[PDB]
Amino acid sequence: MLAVGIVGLPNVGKSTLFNALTRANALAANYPFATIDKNVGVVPLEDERLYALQRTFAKGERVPPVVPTHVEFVDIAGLVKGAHKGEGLGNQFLAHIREVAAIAHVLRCFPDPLEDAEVVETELLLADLATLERRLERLRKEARADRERLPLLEAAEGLYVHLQEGKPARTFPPSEAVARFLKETPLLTAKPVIYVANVAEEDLPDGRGNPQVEAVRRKALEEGAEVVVVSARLEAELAELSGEEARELLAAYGLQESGLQRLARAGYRALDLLTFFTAGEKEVRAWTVRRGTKAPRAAGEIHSDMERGFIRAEVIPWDKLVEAGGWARAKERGWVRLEGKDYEVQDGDVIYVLF
Ligand SMILES: Nc1nc2c(ncn2[C@@H]2O[C@H](COP(=O)(O)OP(=O)(O)O)[C@@H](O)[C@H]2O)c(=O)[nH]1
Numbered sequence: 198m199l200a201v202g203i204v205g206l207p208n209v210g211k212s213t214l215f216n217a218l219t220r221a222n223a224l225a226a227n228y229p230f231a232t233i234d235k236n237v238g239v240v241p242l243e244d245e246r247l248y249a250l251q252r253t254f255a256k257g258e259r260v261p262p263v264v265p266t267h268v269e270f271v272d273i274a275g276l277v278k279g280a281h282k283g284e285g286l287g288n289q290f291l292a293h294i295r296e297v298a299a300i301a302h303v304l305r306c307f308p309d310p311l312e313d314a315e316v317v318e319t320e321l322l323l324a325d326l327a328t329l330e331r332r333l334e335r336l337r338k339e340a341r342a343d344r345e346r347l348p349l350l351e352a353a354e355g356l357y358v359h360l361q362e363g364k365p366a367r368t369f370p371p372s373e374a375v376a377r378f379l380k381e382t383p384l385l386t387a388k389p390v391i392y393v394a395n396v397a398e399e400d401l402p403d404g405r406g407n408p409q410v411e412a413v414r415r416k417a418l419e420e421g422a423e424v425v426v427v428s429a430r431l432e433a434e435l436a437e438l439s440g441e442e443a444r445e446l447l448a449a450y451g452l453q454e455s456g457l458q459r460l461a462r463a464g465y466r467a468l469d470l471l472t473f474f475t476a477g478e479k480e481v482r483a484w485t486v487r488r489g490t491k492a493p494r495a496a497g498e499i500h501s502d503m504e505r506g507f508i509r510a511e512v513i514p515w516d517k518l519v520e521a522g523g524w525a526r527a528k529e530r531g532w533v534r535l536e537g538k539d540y541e542v543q544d545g546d547v548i549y550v551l552f
Contacts (some may be wrong), residue, residue: 198231199487200269201391201464202297204290206277206313209305210395210429215272217429220436221457226264236274239267240461242472242483246515246545250474250481253519264482266472268461271297277320291324291385299389299467301460302422303429306409307397311416314392318420321385322360329357332382352378360386368421389467390422393460398428401452425463427456471544474515475499477524492540496550503550511549512536518547 203218205211222238231237247263254261275290294300302317304310336350352374359369365386369375379387394410404410404426417424435443435455447455469488473495474481484498492512497504512534513527521527535551542548 198237198269198271198296198298199468199470200231200237200271200297201299201301201467202271202273202294203301203303203393204273204277204294204317205303206316209303209313211272211303213433214303214393214395214427214429217432217436217457218270218272220433224440225267227267229269231269234271236272237269239269240457240464241265241267242461242465243458244472244483246474247481247483249519250476250515250547253523254476254478254481256478259478261476261478261480264480266483266485268464268468268470270301270460270464273297273300277317279320281323287320291320294321294385294388295383297388299391299464301391301393301425301464301467303393303395304409304413306394306404306407306413306426307400310394310409311412314413314416314420318365318386322363322365325366325384325386326357326360328382328384329353329360332378333357348374349378349381353382356384365390365420368419389469390420391460391463391467392417392420392422392424394424394426395429396426398431398450400426401428401431401450401456402426423463423467425456425460427460429456432456471542473542473544473546473548475549476515476518476547477549486542490542491538492536492542492548493538495542495548499548499550503552506552507538507550508552509535509537510540510551512540512542512546514543515545515547524549 218238221240225239225241242265244265251261251263273293275293276286277290279287304313333353336346336353339346340350356366356369366384367387392413394404394413396404400407414424470485471488472483472485474483486495492510493504493507496507513532517532518527521530521532527533
C-alpha cells in the first residue's frame with residue numbers, strides 16, 4: 198500500500214490523532230479502494246498551486262473546480278511486544294506493518310518517548326534478522342548456481358552485520374547491491390520512518406525547548422527518521438471546524454499550517470512522491486506518482502489507456518504556465534515541451550497527453 202502506517206504504544210494520543218484523520222478523510226474528493234477498511238483513510242493535500250492555475254484558466258464568470266490529491270494513512274493495529282515463544286503475540290502488528298510503505302510513530306512528549314520508539318524498533322529488528330537469516334541461506338545456494346544473485350547475498354551479509362548491532366536497514370549506506378536486495382526483500386526497518394512528537398499546543402510549532410521533543414530529534418538522527426511535531430488534541434478540535442475557520446483560528450495562535458497538513462507533507466516525502474497537474478478551463482487537478490515515474494505511467498494515472506496509447510505529452514512547469522497565462526500563450530512563448538516515454542515527471546509539471 199502506498200500509505201503511511203501510524204503506530205503507537207498505549208496512551209500517546211494516537212486515537213485522538215485518528216479522530217482528526219477520520220474527520221479529514223470525510224472531506225476527500227476521491228477515495229483509494231483500500232479506504233473501505235475502517236483503519237484506512239486519506240488526508241487531502243492542500244496546494245495553493247491549484248488555485249494559481251485555477252485563476253489562470255478562469256474566464257468570464259466561469260472558474261474551473263480544483264481537485265487536490267491526498268496522502269493515505271493506516272491505523273496500524275496490533276499488540277507490539279511479543280514473547281517470541283511461537284505463541285503468536287505481535288504477529289498481527291508485523292503483518293500490518295508489512296503492508297505500508299512508511300511508518301509514523303506517535304510518541305508522547307507532554308504530561309519516556311525514546312523507550313516507546315525502541316520497543317517498536319526492537320520488534321521490527323527481530324523480524325528482519327529472521328528474514329535475513331532465511332535469505333542468507335537461500336541466496337548462498339542460489340548464487341553458487343547463478344552469479345547474478347551474488348550481489349544480493351553480499352548486500353544481505355552487510356545488512357546482517359548492521360542489524361545485529363541493533364541498527365535499522367534504513368540507515369545502511371546505499372549501494373546498487375543493497376538496493377536490489379531491498380527491492381526483492383522489503384525489510385521492515387528499511388521503511389522510512391517519521392517520529393510524530395505529540396505535544397501540548399503551547400509547544401507548537403517545533404517543540405522548542407521541550408526536552409522530550411529534543412530527545413526525539415536526537416534519536417531520529419540515529420535512526421534515520423524525520424520528525425513532525427503536532428498536538429493531536431488540537432488537530433481533533435480543528436478538524437471539527439470548516440477549513441476557513443480553522444485556518445483563521447490557527448493564524449490567531451501564530452501557527453500557519455495544521456498538524457495534519459504537516460504530517461501529510463512529511464508522509465508525501467517519506468513515500469518519495471511528487472505532484473503533477475492537469476489544467477484547463479474545465480478542471481485543475483493534482484495527481485500523485487512516485488519519484489522516478491515516466492510520462493507514460495504518469496499518463497496512465499489520468500487514463501489507463503494513455504499509458505500504452507502514450508505517444509508523447511505536452512509538459513510545462515506550473516509556474517511557467519501561470520506566467521504565460523494559458524496553454525495557447527505558453528506555446529507562443531515556446532515554454533510548452535513535447536516529452537516522450539523516457540521523460541521522468543518532475544514535481545509541479547502540468548501535463549496534457551497526446552493520444
Ligand atoms: N493536552 C493534550 N492532551 C492530549 C493530546 N493528545 C492526546 N491527549 C490526551 O492523552 C490521553 C491519551 O490519548 P489517546 O488518544 O486515548 O491515546 P492512545 O492510547 O495512543 O489512543 C487522553 O486523555 C487524550 O485526551 C494533546 O495533544 N494535548
